[PDB]
Design a protein around this ligand. Structure first.
Ligand SMILES: OC[C@H]1NC[C@H](O)[C@@H](O)[C@H]1O
Ligand SMILES: OC[C@H]1NC[C@H](O)[C@@H](O)[C@H]1O
Ligand SMILES: [Mg+2]
Ligand SMILES: [Mg+2]
Lengths: 1015, 599
């Protein structure tokens, strides 16, 4: 009968015998237990060891399995995904569906997981009341049997399914059987860009309720004009037999103090011509001076709802956390508690590198702490409802949540083929209505979303209107169909740029400043995705934050995204390594496109995370003379856990220091006057640095946490002292093959055929393994490669333009190599031309001046053909012979920084182990650059100038040829790249050229100089 | 397997294997035939004599009935209601449901009608193409078998159900079996004040289409400021295999004269980031000085849609009647073709004293003539979609139509118990979406209605918005929940008085002059029911007509109602007499309250 109906290939059947959706219940039988949130005896977990067998299709499952255990089944932990235990491969695909597109049919080869559990039920559970089983998430569809008898069917992987088991359970031993299908007609609605996995991946519980029970309750808060008086409105519904003696009490607690209370019999007000709801009641509770909930100060109350008799015998209690806050759109602005929000948001997927899509408390808490420590206030549930514990932790720690329906049909052509079709309106409505019914009581949820990337169809407008009518208290947003349709209260583009338009047919992406002012437009604009964090990325991030602060109706956005979705594999020696699409034999697949996070899958930060922290800070600073103005960007809190540290330094050396407490009202200013600063004798630039420190621990941070910082140049004294005249003169030797210069124990050799410095000796120890040569290329970054789908190549991507022009293959030809003795120096002059099939790309003219002090001054002038694509860099590289433990530099740091991502970095003297100067991105690329550098020390060498550098054990050629970080091997010696100039990295998106014109090397002529000496 | 699933007690299953809804098709294989509206060889009627047996429940039907005819079955005419042949009693109840209210369950004693037909299919129908069966209305739910094999299931009594029979038919003799249930979970949505009857009560047809076919088409008309230039916009969709040589032509005819024409290959404009519809095409035809449709002068054109090859071989044609008119609400007034309407309307049920709820051409024509001879210009389909011929006759003779979804839950307490519940949103959406997809091309339909007497729930606001988005060309109205909710473009009270207020709790009936001017109110007001014509009645009628003429935003209303719903019984001498509720042993019942007509 079950394989006869094939309910998984039928969009009109989304469930059989499933109970209504409701807020989370524990059925306490004691009000004190409910108030203090203690564990309930009536709610029993079935997590643990279950039996499991895998089958290639549902027709291959033996009939005996319903009756009793299969001999060849294994013991496995629930919750889990079965791909993580090795039964079949996880599939990573972005847009293309992982099955043939033939809606609503799915392949006959439909992998099937059979789970089963034997468990004991207590005798008191069968005498009276209702027993239900709850599956918090099953992917993608399943049938359930209890003691051999069929119970029901469910679809939608991301919301709980509940079934009544009262008529199926017996005293003693019981057996559940659950058959889970990988594919169903629900799969057409679940095309998110993520690993496709399956199984029972969220918790399983039994819940015991009495026959007369609370079946639903809703909480709402209404305010006066100044938020000094609130009304809590609770609506309660019951199921079972109505009696005259039944009563409902709602009490409101703040800690241990009862703050409000109300009691009533059942019976709503008249609703229409036929009467009202006999089985419902509304309580109104007045609260004076309520403490308001926000992400800055997450004040919660506890509401307890009791069903009891008139004589006062308790039947059951339920409870939730309540926050008083009002969200609304007024005159084009999104307001919380009367103030305009600025969203510092990120998109987050539920992902764990060992457990796949199984989430636990420990990982959720780790994410929330790291988010708040980096100045995030908001999270977008991309793109499905989360584990129910997630919303509780966002209520307690304080994050705003955007809660999103599990609907994405990206792989359809056109994108709205299903969402414009009335036969799929039933399936889509279950995904939205059940999410709102589960989550409507959480204060942290402030916006509902209709899904992601499904075009714009009439089913979207209908569901938009359904939510506005059942829940008027939250705005609704939807990005599909060009980001400003009639199904959204907020304009919510993805990857729109700050200043540049992208005029695509039908769905243009205006620049964000222009979009606000299109004729007729009045809504606020919040980007649902911006700043694609794929690999070495977030260039141009500061330009979004400058716009968000200047324009009132630009209210921020959600970065894409929090955590890299990589998985762990083991090699032959059992060493773990990070894997991406294609590494499991999954095909077709979309390769590294699954790794887009600010943090690695193990929750270690990428260098871009510090850039986000700095642009999102809650204190802004200005300097005028000796005065710092501090401006608070808090909306609700006074700065009561904040002190300002300032320091004045001269080229790294500290000169003066101090601290000042911060006493600044929300949205206010404070002026801090600095002491008379010292006048130093010596040459150099003075630097002032301020940092805001939190002296006391919070729920989310340690004592000493740095929350904000800023650096300025003060007075500069230029150096007018001429170098001391030495008595030694460098000696020049000319052979046919070489110029050699000697001075003491030091020796330099220049090859007369190649025209480069080929060797240096200190004593009799060689210093180079490779000559010092010009470099114009970089191992390309993900933003340079410019691919979102592995099958589709963009000929406008930087890496395509550089390969076509021959930048990676260009050969140096020598034009000139000459040597001359001056009075106190030897001068070497060289010129080279880089050519590819007749065309000259670059010319480089160089002088080397070696004086009596030992210092070698290098001067470089480069010309770049105006019709070649602009180069990625202009500098020198070589392979040094020695490996040292430390790197010491005077310049921006201490983390990796690039010309379009250097606002977070500070000028100072930095000292790190060599291994910290390499960023281990899983897909290897150019990495580890430090800009604005004046001095670099490594072993005996010192370089001085005004340059960017990177230093490591991997060549640019090795990083370009290697697809995975675990396959890189350290080379002999150390590779040094020293650049006079370096292109930006981009990252407005990663599938089209995104470097802004002010970060391209387009000048045509370039000059820089270095001194190389031995300290 | 069929009595194991019990699909009739489950609001989440409204159909199995039913094809998509679409405007009426005849599949002509010749453009001239399509233009002149001649009978199609590809559309075959199965009306006539069928076999029929009655059973007290679905579990009492013998298994043999699927294979072959029962000996104790009778010969009966289809279409019919089985209560009119004496198999059980018709029930007249106004508000109270005729079953125990226990949604979604129905009684186990669920009278069951088993119909069957033996018929011949021509050999050319099985070689190529698709063959479908169409039931225009079955009350209330049914399973269908062909040659012993289960085909599908449908609910909603008032809209067509279609099933593909290509894989089930054989050459020579075929047998259909249809098992019809009186009660289903669909009955909770069908609580209209009328006789409760059952059976196959509208036509049954076979339709033959080619494998590559026109699957849907829509017609829309846009105008300049003075109605001197129009654009006819036709959207056409196909099913089957896309080829480069396929083309669509739309021509527009006024009598014998071709007036406009356009041709194109398949391929819509870009819609979004993934492209456009490869299997759709939009033609735009310009028309100068079009003759405008109205109820006073019902000027029609004929649109012919041909699917053909580039060399000009015709694959199939479809056609409809087109009227050029614009309906809109502007500054609080309902305008047709730029002028403010005054609705002289009546509510009409499909009722015949001998045949029950079976409608025929002759009775429809008799009603329309009497309506127009008595100065009516408008009719409200109370409270369900009509027989498809009704809309064609209102196009040709000139009446405005309000077309209403088959949803009424009057007997619930409170009235919005189902329509405020998201688990019934699937069932309700099928009733609205399939009606709009069937009727959107008729010029006579000028307003959509969401149903009748179902309170006001969130399912109403969602469906209101669904229609405004798929069909912006007609206003939407809904009376429930106090007549002026967010689910209506028109204030549409029932039985509000001219000068006197009726201040009921939650749902007051203001007098109509006062309602127009409540702070914030800007919509026009048209009474969806007024002046109850029960017996010796219509006193005070002149006072409504005086108000309608004096106030611009009072634009008329629909009288309740056209025809008395009485039935014929026979005495001992065989003399016919008119019967009302209770005269068939039906109990409980609401007595003479079923007779409310002007005729
Ligand atoms: O990584 C690209 C990014 N683009 C937009 C989508 O919403 C995300 O799921 C993701 O696919
Ligand atoms: O005859 C009373 C009348 N009242 C209003 C209803 O809509 C009609 O169906 C009818 O019941
Ligand atoms: Mg996508
Ligand atoms: Mg009624």
């Amino acid at each position: 009968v079950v394989l006869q109906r094939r309910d998984w290939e039928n969009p009109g059947v989304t469930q059989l015998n499933r109970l209504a959706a409701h807020p989370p219940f524990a059925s306490w039988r004691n009000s004190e237990e409910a108030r203090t949130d203690r564990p309930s005896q009536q709610l029993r977990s079935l997590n643990g060891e279950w039996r499991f067998a895998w089958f290639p299709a549902p027709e291959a499952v033996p009939e005996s399995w319903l009756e009793c255990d299969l001999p060849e089944a294994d013991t496995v932990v629930v919750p889990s995904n079965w791909q993580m235990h090795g039964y079949d491969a996880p599939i990573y695909t972005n847009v293309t569906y992982p099955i043939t597109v033939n809606p609503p049919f799915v392949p006959t080869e439909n992998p099937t997981g059979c789970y089963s559990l034997t468990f004991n039920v207590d005798e008191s559970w069968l005498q009276e009341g209702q027993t239900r089983i709850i599956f918090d998430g099953v992917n993608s569809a399943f049938h359930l049997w209890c003691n051999g008898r069929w119970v029901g069917y469910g679809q939608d992987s991301r919301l709980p399914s509940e079934f009544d088991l009262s008529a199926f359970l017996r005293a003693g031993e019981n057996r559940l059987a659950v058959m889970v299908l990988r594919w169903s007609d629900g799969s057409y609605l679940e095309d998110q860009d993520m690993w496709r996995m399956s199984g029972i991946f969220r918790d399983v519980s039994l819940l015991h309720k009495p026959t007369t029970q609370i079946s639903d309750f809703h909480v709402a808060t209404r305010f006066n004009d100044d938020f000094s008086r609130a009304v809590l409105e609770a609506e309660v519904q019951m199921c079972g037999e109505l009696r005259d003696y039944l009563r409902v009490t709602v009490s409101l607690w703040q800690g241990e103090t009862q703050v409000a209370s109300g009691t009533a019999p059942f019976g709503g007000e008249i609703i229409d011509e036929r009467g009202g709801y006999a089985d419902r009641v509304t309580l109104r509770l007045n609260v004076e001076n309520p403490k308001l909930w926000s992400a800055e100060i997450p004040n919660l109350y506890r509401a307890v709802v009791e069903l009891h008799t008139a004589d006062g015998t308790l039947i059951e209690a339920e409870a939730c956390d309540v926050g008083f806050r009002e969200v609304r759109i007024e005159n084009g602005l999104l307001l919380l508690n009367g103030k305009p929000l600025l969203i510092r948001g990120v998109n987050r997927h539920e992902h764990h590198p060992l457990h796949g899509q199984v989430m636990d408390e420990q990982t959720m808490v780790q994410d929330i702490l790291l988010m708040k420590q980096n100045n995030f206030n908001a999270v977008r549930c991309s793109h499905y409802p989360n584990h129910p514990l997630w919303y509780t932790l966002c209520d307690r720690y304080g994050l705003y949540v955007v809660d999103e329906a599990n609907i994405e049909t990206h792989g359809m052509v056109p994108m709205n083929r299903l969402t414009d079709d009335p036969r799929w309106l039933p399936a889509m409505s279950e995904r939205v209505t059940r999410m709102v019914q589960r989550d409507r009581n959480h204060p942290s949820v402030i916006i509902w979303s209709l899904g992601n990337e499904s075009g714009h169809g009439a089913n979207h407008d209908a569901l938009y209107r359904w939510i506005k009518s059942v829940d008027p208290s939250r705005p609704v947003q939807y990005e599909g169909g060009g980001a400003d349709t009639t199904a959204t209260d907020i304009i919510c583009p993805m990857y729109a740029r700050v200043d540049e338009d992208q005029p695509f047919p039908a769905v243009p992406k205006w620049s964000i400043k222009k979009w606000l002012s299109l004729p007729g437009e009045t809504r606020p604009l919040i980007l649902c995705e911006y700043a694609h964090a794929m690999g070495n990325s977030l260039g141009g991030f500061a330009k979004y934050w400058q716009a968000f602060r200047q324009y009132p109706r630009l209210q921020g956005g959600f970065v894409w995204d929090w955590v890299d979705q990589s998985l762990i594999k083991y090699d032959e020696n059992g060493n773990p390594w990070s894997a991406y699409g294609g590494d499991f034999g999954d095909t077709p697949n979309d390769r590294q496109f699954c790794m887009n996070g600010l943090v690695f899958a193990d929750r270690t930060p990428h260098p871009a995370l510090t850039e986000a922290k700095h642009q999102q800070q809650f204190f802004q600073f200005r300097l005028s003379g000796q005065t710092i103005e501090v401006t608070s960007e808090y909306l609700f809190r006074h700065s009561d856990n904040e002190l300002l540290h300032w320091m004045v330094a001269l080229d790294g050396k500290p000169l003066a220091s101090g601290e000042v407490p911060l006493d600044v009202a929300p949205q206010g200013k404070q002026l801090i006057e600095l002491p008379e600063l010292p006048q130093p004798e010596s040459a150099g630039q003075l630097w002032l640095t301020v940092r805001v420190v939190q002296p006391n621990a919070t729920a989310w941070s340690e004592a000493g946490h740095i929350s904000a910082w800023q650096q300025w140049r003060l007075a500069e004294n230029l150096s007018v002292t001429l170098p001391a005249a030495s008595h030694a003169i460098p000696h020049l030797t000319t052979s046919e093959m070489d110029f050699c210069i000697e001075l003491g124990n030091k020796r330099w050799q220049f090859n007369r055929q190649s025209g480069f410095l080929s060797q240096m000796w200190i004593g009799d120890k060689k210093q180079l393994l490779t000559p010092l040569r010009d470099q114009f290329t970089r191992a390309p970054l993900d933003n340079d490669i410019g691919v979102s789908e592995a099958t589709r190549i963009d000929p406008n991507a930087w890496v395509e333009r550089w390969k076509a022009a021959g930048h990676y293959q260009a050969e140096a030809a020598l034009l000139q190599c000459t040597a001359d003795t001056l009075a106190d120096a030897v001068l070497i002059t060289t010129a080279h031309a880089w050519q590819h099939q007749g065309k000259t790309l670059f010319i480089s003219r160089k002088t080397y001046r070696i004086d009596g002090s030992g210092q070698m001054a290098i001067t470089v002038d480069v010309e770049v053909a105006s019709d070649t694509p602009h180069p990625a860099r202009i500098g020198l590289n070589c392979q040094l012979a020695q490996v040292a433990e430390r790197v010491n530099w005077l310049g921006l740091g201490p983390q990796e920084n690039y010309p379009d991502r250097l606002t977070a970095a500070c000028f100072d003297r930095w000292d790190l182990p060599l291994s910290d100067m390499y960023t281990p991105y899983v897909f290897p690329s150019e990495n580890g650059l430090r800009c604005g550098t004046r001095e670099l020390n490594y072993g005996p060498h010192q370089w001085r100038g005004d340059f960017q550098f990177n230093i490591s054990r991997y060549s640019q050629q090795q990083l370009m040829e290697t697809s995975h970080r675990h396959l890189l091997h350290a080379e002999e010696g150390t590779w040094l790249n020293i650049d006079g100039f370096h292109m930006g990295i981009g990252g407005d998106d990663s599938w089209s050229p995104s470097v802004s014109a002010e970060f391209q090397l387009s000048a045509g002529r370039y000059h820089y100089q270095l001194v190389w000496c031995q300290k």
